[PDB]
Design an enzyme around this catalytic site. Structure first.
Site, mmCIF file in Angstrom:
data_model
loop_
_atom_site.group_PDB
_atom_site.id
_atom_site.type_symbol
_atom_site.label_atom_id
_atom_site.label_comp_id
_atom_site.label_asym_id
_atom_site.label_seq_id
_atom_site.Cartn_x
_atom_site.Cartn_y
_atom_site.Cartn_z
ATOM 1 N N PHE A 59 0.841 -1.188 0.000
ATOM 2 C CA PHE A 59 0.000 0.000 0.000
ATOM 3 C C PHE A 59 0.884 1.249 0.000
ATOM 4 O O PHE A 59 0.995 1.914 -1.036
ATOM 5 C CB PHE A 59 -0.979 -0.058 1.182
ATOM 6 N N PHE A 112 2.855 10.429 1.793
ATOM 7 C CA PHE A 112 3.119 9.023 1.618
ATOM 8 C C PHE A 112 3.752 8.710 0.291
ATOM 9 O O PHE A 112 3.596 9.446 -0.696
ATOM 10 C CB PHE A 112 1.903 8.170 1.889
ATOM 11 N N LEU A 121 -7.597 7.215 -4.165
ATOM 12 C CA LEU A 121 -7.136 8.455 -3.554
ATOM 13 C C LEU A 121 -7.164 9.622 -4.523
ATOM 14 O O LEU A 121 -6.965 10.760 -4.107
ATOM 15 C CB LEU A 121 -5.726 8.270 -2.991
#
Length: 164
Positions: A59, A112, A121
């Protein structure tokens, strides 16, 4: 023209390697500049010495909380928070650098590094850069993560700055 910044990563204090990022200053100048300045520390605060507090294999790796070290802190060079600049760029796969947030227009310093395509996202988190060199180092970091995000060793940005 786009700036390149580097992080030197350590694992429980032992050097792991270097990751470098291209920042898309041509498309998201305000967001790129925040990350660039936090990487050089030129404003008097920034990423050097901070940790990656949440790593979920398959992820992402999340860091940038240099004030509380756990996902509850951080601040931008513009103040506590700044607006979502635009959503031109998408989360297209591993290596994408994107801003963490807690709702619309709440960008600070947390970010991130995606290690997978994270298309859900898109339109919610501002993409502003990508790994240029050292994706293998990101993959190595990923192995210290876990399903709940807790790291098995302390992953830190031992040094950081601008290359170009």
């Amino acid at each position: 023209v786009n700036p390149t910044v580097f992080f030197d990563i350590a694992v429980d204090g032992e050097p792991l390697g270097r990751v470098s990022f291209e920042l898309f200053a041509d498309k998201v100048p305000k967001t790129a500049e925040n990350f660039r300045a936090l990487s050089t520390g030129e404003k008097g605060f920034g990423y050097k010495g901070s940790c990656f507090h949440r790593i979920i294999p398959g992820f992402m790796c999340q860091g940038g909380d240099f004030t509380r070290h756990n996902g509850t802190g951080g601040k931008s060079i513009y103040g506590e928070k700044f607006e979502d600049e635009n959503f031109i760029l998408k989360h297209t796969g591993p290596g994408i650098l994107s801003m963490a947030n807690a709702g619309p227009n709440t960008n600070g310093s947390q970010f991130f590094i995606c290690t997978a395509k994270t298309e859900w996202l898109d339109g919610k988190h501002v993409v502003f850069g990508k790994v240029k060199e050292g994706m293998n180092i990101v993959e190595a970091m990923e192995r210290f993560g876990s399903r709940n995000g807790k790291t098995s060793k302390k992953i830190t940005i031992a040094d950081c700055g601008q290359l170009e």
